[PDB]
């Protein structure tokens, strides 16, 4: 089962889920064993504190049943890691708002703009009318590409001149979305790396200006991060969460990275729903995150 | 690849998968719509019981999600139909036995003998040695076709005179396969005229097999023809008569009634090992439920 997800997770599977099978084969449960396991979890980008949590519950659970063969750790690990992901299994529901405003935050070059396009096309396939706000206002090439993408797919894109105030663009977009009975408004934002404090105050300004038109907006604050960037994904999540308060995460580029295990760190450290995972190039490969599917593909033996 | 798979399903896609799109376009979610959808599933050979389950789950999930637009039923239906096939998505693994014995059951004229040849060539291509047993012993023309095929393809075929005891032929083939360290033995009657006979003959075959290897047959594989509820009915008969462990469904291409795969999956819960979607050896595809669903529900809008 799950042949496509298993292929996407091939490099992750070398260290997590099925990768544990060779690590445990014919070993006994002792400190040597748990030390090897901790090393492997850290190599897989699971994170220092998440790994310590797993080893602790795993060691206590082994002791209680007086488990002796390391092979018996497998089911316990699958349960422990499964519960980490279950806590952030919650599909995004955009129904019933006029418009449902998604604020897309995150650094440039990690699939934020790709994710906007795929979400837009999915929502329109669902029968919703979508509009985009080109809030990354100082990147003239990014804004023009977004506008060209909108013209190609008959989706309105609200934009202003290079250097325009992003909070102004997004205000004008909410106003236009409301006038045009738009169901989902997806607002891009700047993702420059220099000067982190400036970007964060810019996002807080956007949120305050939105609330001049709708106090429930933004209805979703969605971070996009790229699994191939390993722990940098965690550090980005922390920065954006502390600044504007995330309500959802999209984790892209799971296919072809050995660092997919960063999902556990993201899930455990923040408890924010992971709404979507990106497991390939298709629109349909931005998949709603389903924890038990992910675990099954990972641990399938 | 995936593009050939989509093309091979175009006729079934008229009414299932992407065939649902025109049905939902601009409609409200009400009983008229669910009635039309139920009728469309039944026409596609999904089956009364399986259709009732799909419609019930879809209706409940639409309510809970508070859906407004019929277009949004598409993703829920893709998930419901995908879950039916996920539950029978276990691949056949023929490795590690001397020989791995596949007992091929099914009626005559549904691609059973074609499937035997394609599997034999696929296994050979993977580096495994293969033997066939001509267990359809009262049909002289069929035995000779199988012998001719084995001659043409340099694969040994164990056979006896017309009217030989099937279980004895298969007994002799397992003996020979074991002596020659053959990796895979594929054993071929499929007469439904007196079904009480055919079924008792299968139980005799299995009993005799177990004299030489208590694990044999390692797989009991039914073959049925997707272009034929006859295929649903043959699976019921063989399922109750013998313990099926796998199912091959042939001729999915060029037929517009692709729902039998869903009815078979849901009613019996037996793994679907292979689907035949064309004339080439490789068009007998190891079944991947996720690939199949994606091809069936592929949409470009
Ligand atoms: N998916 C997606 C996508 C593809 C191209 C562009 C260009 C600007 N935004 C885009 C989004
Ligand atoms: N265009 C624009 C616009 C309109 C109102 C406010 C309020 C704060 N920024 C704004 C920008
Ligand atoms: N693939 C295949 C195939 C087609 C015809 C016969 C007849 C006896 N074995 C057969 C195998
Ligand atoms: N050829 C043949 C054969 C040999 C032994 C037994 C035992 C039961 N059936 C058998 C058939
Ligand atoms: Na499968």
Curated annotation (Swiss-Prot), chain A:
Activity regulation summary: Conformation of the Ffh-FtsY complex and regulation of its GTPase activity are modulated by the 4.5S RNA. Formation of the FfH-FtsY complex leads to a mutual stimulation of both GTPases.
Post-translational modifications: Proteolytically cleaved. The cleavage may regulate function and subcellular location of FtsY. Full-length FtsY is found primarily associated with the membrane, while cleaved protein is predominantly present in the cytoplasm.
GO cellular component: cytoplasmic side of plasma membrane; cytosol; plasma membrane
EC numbers on record: 3.6.5.4
Keyword Transcription: no
An annotated Gene Ontology molecular function: protein homodimerization activity
Localization, UniProt: Cell inner membrane; Cytoplasm
GO biological process, one term: stringent response
Binding-site residues for GTP, renumbered to this chain: 106-113, 188-192, 252-255
Free-text domain note: Contains an acidic N-terminal A domain, a central N domain and a C-terminal GTPase G domain that can bind and hydrolyze GTP. Contains at least two lipid-binding sites. The first site contains the first 14 amino acids (helix 1) and the second binding site is an amphipathic alpha-helix located at the interface between the A- and the N-domain (helix 2).
Free-text function comment from the UniProt entry: Involved in targeting and insertion of nascent membrane proteins into the cytoplasmic membrane. Acts as a receptor for the complex formed by the signal recognition particle (SRP) and the ribosome-nascent chain (RNC). Interaction with SRP-RNC leads to the transfer of the RNC complex to the Sec translocase for insertion into the membrane, the hydrolysis of GTP by both Ffh and FtsY, and the dissociation of the SRP-FtsY complex into the individual components.
Protein name: Signal recognition particle receptor FtsY
Species of the source: Escherichia coli (strain K12)
Curated annotation (Swiss-Prot), chain B:
Record carries keyword Transferase: no
Subcellular location: Cell inner membrane; Cytoplasm
Gene Ontology cellular-component annotations: cytoplasmic side of plasma membrane; cytosol; plasma membrane
EC number of the protein: 3.6.5.4
PTM statement from Swiss-Prot or TrEMBL: Proteolytically cleaved. The cleavage may regulate function and subcellular location of FtsY. Full-length FtsY is found primarily associated with the membrane, while cleaved protein is predominantly present in the cytoplasm.
Coiled coil: none
Residues the entry annotates as binding GTP: 106-113, 188-191, 250-253
Membrane protein topology class: Peripheral membrane protein
Null mutant phenotype: Deletion affects both cell morphology and protein export. Mutants are defective in the insertion into the cytoplasmic membrane of three topologically distinct membrane proteins, MalF, AcrB and FtsQ.
Record-level Gene Ontology MF annotations: ATP hydrolysis activity; GTP binding; GTPase activity; protein homodimerization activity; signal recognition particle binding
Keyword Secreted among record annotations: no
Main location per the UniProt record: membrane
GO biological process: protein targeting; SRP-dependent cotranslational protein targeting to membrane; stringent response
Reported regulation of activity: Conformation of the Ffh-FtsY complex and regulation of its GTPase activity are modulated by the 4.5S RNA. Formation of the FfH-FtsY complex leads to a mutual stimulation of both GTPases.
Key words of the record: Cell inner membrane, Cell membrane, Cytoplasm, GTP-binding, Hydrolase, Membrane, Nucleotide-binding, Receptor
Reaction(s) catalysed by this chain's protein: GTP + H2O = GDP + phosphate + H(+)
Family (UniProt): Belongs to the GTP-binding SRP family. FtsY subfamily.
Function (record text): Involved in targeting and insertion of nascent membrane proteins into the cytoplasmic membrane. Acts as a receptor for the complex formed by the signal recognition particle (SRP) and the ribosome-nascent chain (RNC). Interaction with SRP-RNC leads to the transfer of the RNC complex to the Sec translocase for insertion into the membrane, the hydrolysis of GTP by both Ffh and FtsY, and the dissociation of the SRP-FtsY complex into the individual components.
Quaternary context: Part of the signal recognition particle protein translocation system, which is composed of SRP and FtsY. SRP is a ribonucleoprotein composed of Ffh and a 4.5S RNA molecule. Binds to SecY.
Domain remarks in the Swiss-Prot or TrEMBL record: Contains an acidic N-terminal A domain, a central N domain and a C-terminal GTPase G domain that can bind and hydrolyze GTP. Contains at least two lipid-binding sites. The first site contains the first 14 amino acids (helix 1) and the second binding site is an amphipathic alpha-helix located at the interface between the A- and the N-domain (helix 2).
This protein's name: Signal recognition particle receptor FtsY
Gene name tied to this protein: ftsY
Portion of the parent chain present: 196 to 497 of 497
